Structure formats: structure tokens, C-alpha cells
Amino acid sequence: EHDCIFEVKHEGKVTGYACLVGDKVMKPAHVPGVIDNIDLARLSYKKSSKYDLECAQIPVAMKSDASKYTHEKPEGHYNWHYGAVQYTGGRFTVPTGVGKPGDSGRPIFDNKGRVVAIVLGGANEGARTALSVVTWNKDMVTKITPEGTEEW
Amino acid sequence: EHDCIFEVKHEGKVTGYACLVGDKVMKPAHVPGVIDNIDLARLSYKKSSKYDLECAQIPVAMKSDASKYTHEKPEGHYNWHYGAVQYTGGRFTVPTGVGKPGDSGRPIFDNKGRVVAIVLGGANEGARTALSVVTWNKDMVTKITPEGTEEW
Amino acid sequence: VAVSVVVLLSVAASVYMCVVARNKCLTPYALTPGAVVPVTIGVLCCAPK
């Protein structure tokens, strides 16, 4: 697999995603439910309140082929599951409304594949939409949600 | 290539593989039965339980038979006695699952001749295997392990 | 009996608030990819590094 999604499925249907990075299975705590995979369920997911994150440590030998995290971001064009994101001046946008209302754990990475941020959702503003994100970077985690961007 | 790595023998069986760099004979401290070369084994070595290392002081007549080294760890992929090694994000892996118990003692190189890692034990996961080495940092030398190992 | 129960509850509230302060303090280190857990290890549960 290369798509980190590992679909978080609830009541048989799906409700979002989660990613596996570095040593950690992180779930956006904004989403309710468990993931589709079986053996990734017996973990003590720690809960952060003020920003939604539900990290837990990987177990032993759990095919640690995860993506690579580089705590830096030059400005330009990065890769995204649906297309190509533009990053300029600390603002972080894409085409408007093309993203579905439920892509809720999709990460972002460079041309090479060096992941940096994770996603929370979008809104309807114009042709360019503001991507509300929590993000791991600068050797910590933080949240940048704009005004008016309601969660996906 | 061949840079005089020295085995430990007992009863007809060889696992322990000492190496010697600069002035110091660095030996992993497993599988006793000290080396066949008695001109190099009559030396009272100092043992460190924290770092699992043996730190015998070379005899002066062996002035030439060692290697060069380095106190910095550049970034990329390297070679070793078996295959390739990939060192990124501050940690090592080994090429694809080939290691066996008793290989504790081979050194790891760069693309131009120096020597950095000495391997004690490792962790099986699947595709790209993990391993614990002792390595240099500007005369302040530590140990680093992955989590999930069996000592080799 | 009143002073005994208020001593009990005051101690319990102090301990509860101290441990939840520690728990809030440790949280942004377990979340991020890349463990650092700096020189303040004296109150720490993050062992393996």
C-alpha cells in the first residue's frame, strides 16, 4: 500500500481515514469509529482535546513502512490525493469544492513523498478554498484553522 | 573491502567479530572465548555494561592495521559486509531481511572509506529490518536501539 | 469527621489537579512524529526513545 488511508469504517460504511507515519498510527479525533484493519485495534489511543489527534504507538514488527516526516516546507506545489496543493506565505489552499466533504485524514507530501501536514476540511469561499489543518511540524504539533472554514 | 575484521573462536565455532579502529580495539561483548590471536588477546580489556562494548588498547606493533573513521553521520545510503544500508531520519535499516544471529561485529562504511556503525542486535519487522548500533558523535559516544529487537 | 473528610478531599483534589496538569504537559510530545522528550525527563513516562 501507498495510500495511508486504512479506511475508518463505522457501522459497515466509512466515516473517514487515519494515517500511519514514522512510528505512530494517528487518527483525527474529530472522527468517530474504528478503522477497517483488525490487528490495529488493541492500542491505547491517547486523546488530545484542544486539537483533534488520537495518536498511539505502533506495535512490534508492524510492517513499519510508513512515510517520512520532514519538519520544513518550502513554498510551491505539493502533492495531494485529489490534485496539487499551492503553498504561499503560510497560507494553504487548493481549488474550491472539488474536495469531497469527507476526506478527513488525507495527508500531504512533496514531490518525493516527504509528508508534513494532515487535513481537517474545507469551506466555500471562491475559486480557492482555505484548508483548515492541524499539522505536525516545527518539532511539535499545532492547528491552523481559518475563520469560517467549517470541518469536513 | 577487506580491512582485517577479527573473529572470536571457541571449540571450533566462530560468531564474535571484533574490529579495531584508530587506537582502540572495539569488541561487542557477547560470546566469550577471546580471539585466536594471542598476541592481540593477552591485553587486559575494559568492559562497559551500559554500552556492551569492549575497549582494549591496541599494541603499538599493530600501528598500521586499522581504518579511518568519522565523528559525523552524513545522509544517504551506504554499504556493508552483506549488502546496502539506508540511513535516513536519524536511523538505520538493512537491505531486505538477510541477517542471522552471530553477525555482531561487522562495521558499516561510507561511499569513500570511513567507518561509522558497529552492530550488536536488531529487530525483525518484515520488509526492511532494523538494527542497533553504537556510533560516534564528537567524542561523546552513545548507543541507539530500535524497539522490538532480539540481540544477535 | 468533618475535618477528616475535608482533609481527604483537599488532598485528592490537589493530586487530581497536579496529575492532570502533568498529563496536559506531556501530551504534545506523544503526538508528533519524532520523539525528543527533553532534559525534563524527571516526570516522564516516555521511556523507549
Author numbering:
A (entry chain A), B (entry chain J): 107 to 258
C (entry chain C): 371 to 419
Task: Quote the paper.
Here we describe the structure of mature and infective MAYV particles obtained by cryo-EM at 4.4 Å resolution, allowing the observation of N-glycosylation sites in MAYV E1–E2 spikes. The presence of the E3 protein was not observed, nor in the cryo-EM density map, even with a low-density threshold value, nor in SDS-PAGE gel carried out with the purified MAYV used for cryo-EM data collection. A total of 80 spikes, formed by trimers of E1–E2 heterodimers, protrude from the MAYV membrane. Similar to other alphaviruses, the MAYV asymmetric unit (ASU) is composed by four E1–E2-capsid units (T = 4) and maintained by eight main interaction interfaces. The high frequency of histidine residues forming the E1–E2 interface reflect the plasticity of E1–E2 pH-dependent interaction and their role in the spike assembly/disassembly process. N-Glycosylation at MAYV E2 N262 protrudes in a long, continuous and branched density in direction to a symmetric N-glycosylation at the neighbouring E2, which is reminiscent of a molecular handshake. The MAYV density map suggests the extra density could be occupied by a fatty acid that may enhance interactions between E1 and E2.
Mayaro virus (MAYV) is an emerging arbovirus of the Americas that may cause a debilitating arthritogenic disease. Mature, infective alphaviruses are icosahedral enveloped particles of ~70 nm in diameter composed of the structural proteins capsid (C), E1 and E2. The E1 and E2 proteins are transmembrane proteins that are organized in heterodimers.
